[model samples]
Target chain A: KLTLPAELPDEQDLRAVLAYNMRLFRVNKGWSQEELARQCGLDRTYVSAVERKRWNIALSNIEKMAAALGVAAYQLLLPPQERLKLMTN
Target chain B: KLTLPAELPDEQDLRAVLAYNMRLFRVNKGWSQEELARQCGLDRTYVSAVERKRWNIALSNIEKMAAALGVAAYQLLLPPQERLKLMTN
Candidate 1:
């Protein structure tokens, strides 16, 4: 079987998770990728790529996107243990 | 009356700070952005944006940059508290 990001990105364990969470959060907020992209200074194609994990962008971009969506990057990237605590409380 | 990334990036406290540190480390080691970019297969202009905080890229690219820079992404992004604990004598 073949999969991308084969073994996850190096040192981005937290970062990748945050990217995933950002997508979740954006959708939850009823914002389309284009809308959020505009708010964050990015193109719709780029935003959609990010949501689909098709682009290997950078943390800075991620932060900008998160801010446009009204959430902190740390809040999105917290590890599972921390995430569980946040969600429960 | 002059500031940029003025409010710090959201969800990227660790990530932006890490990008800053990586720039410091690379310059300290005398590696040109172009040289490092080759090792990471990234564009020199893009890498420069990341270092200077001019562009909001992604955590994934940051991890890739850190990996090619021969350090873990987390190591690059660790907060001051943890950073000191790890680097202090």
Candidate 2:
């Protein structure tokens, strides 16, 4: 698909959006999961879990990951297609 | 003022917005802090701390509060002023 769904998934929508955007931003920044984890002071497995939408996540760690990726934590929680409009960079 | 600001705060913007909306959503639902906490299975003290912008928060708790308040967890994390635009209800 050219874009992700505009609305959220039926379940785990919060984690879904965060996972999509986290991977999107990470890839856009040219960072591997390991490198992203390193930047954020988390383990690679943790980053992997987040990208896979397996982690529930804490706000402090959300802040850490966003800072590492140079984004506001809320951006990571935006719906995937909604964020597409803001990703013109 | 007619509405909240249009952008996020410079620092702790995510937390600030979450706190602002948490209280806003709670009051709109005619729920007090203790009632909200009871609905979400959290302590009243914890809810107070979150409203006070003193908690980093875990996603599971975020989900609990959102579910209790009838919102998406990500909605709780939106920028304070931005959320005002979505408050027609």
Candidate 3:
């Protein structure tokens, strides 16, 4: 029940998977990109860019984002399909 | 069989897990940190800092390190327990 998968089926790489899951979790919380960014203490532009897979996100920021999003950092890297399942079930 | 764990029992955080796995894989290859860094196109000092868990590493460079070490990018984020089992068995 505590397991996680790091890549989404539709993503080309881990970055894409992270990008997808980041948005998925944020939306699930009804938080806008800017809201999530504010919670993460990062700029909205940086959060938007990360969602767009524009840059390789680092662990410290990922940790911050995950903490603000109320999930484990690795959970942020997990596939959204499983993350969604966990939430719905 | 294709699953991975992202936390290690002894570590304080994901960075420690990553640092542990990074060294584990590099040592398995019998390659020095310098060699791994060279393969990943990063500086040896950078690799050393990463292994020491001194800084948060980014995804692009994690991908490069994984490619050079012959594992998936997400694998680097995995707990070393499963990784050691996989390698030994």
- Candidate with best DockQ: 2
Q: Summing lDDT over every window of 10 consecutive residues in candidate 1 chain B, give the lowest-scoring window.
A: B1-10
The best candidate by lDDT is 2
> Considering only N, C-alpha and C atoms within 3 Å, which residue pairs clash in candidate 2?
none
Candidate 1 lDDT over A1-89, as tens digits, reads 21123233222464455545656666677767677788889989887776566766666676677677776444555444445654897
In candidate 3, which residue ranges exceed 4 Å CA deviation?
A1-10, A79-89, B1-12, B81-89
Query: Tens digits of per-residue lDDT for model 3 on B1-89?
Result: 21222445453377887887787778888778888999989999999888778887887887788889998666677666655775897
Alpha-carbon deviation at B72 in model 2, angstroms: 2.4
Model 1 chain A weakest lDDT span, ten residues long: A1-10
> lDDT per residue, candidate 2, A1-89, as tens digits?
12332444434577877877877788888888888999998999998888777987999899898889998677777776565555863
Candidate 1 deviant stretches above 4 angstroms: A1-16, A79-81, A85-89, B1-16, B19-58, B64-89
Ten contiguous residues with the weakest lDDT in model 2 chain B: B1-10
Give the Cα RMSD of candidate 2: 5.6
Query: Interface Cα RMSD for all candidates?
Result: 4.0, 1.6, 2.0
Interface RMSD (Cα, Å) for model 3? 2.0
lDDT head-to-head 2 vs 3, winner:
2
Judged by DockQ cut-offs, the docking class of candidate 2 is medium
List the candidates' TM-scores in order.
Answer: 0.48, 0.77, 0.73
Two-way TM-score contest, 1 vs 3, winner: 3
State how far residue A20 of model 1 sits from its true place (Å): 2.1
Name every residue pair that clashes in candidate 3.
none
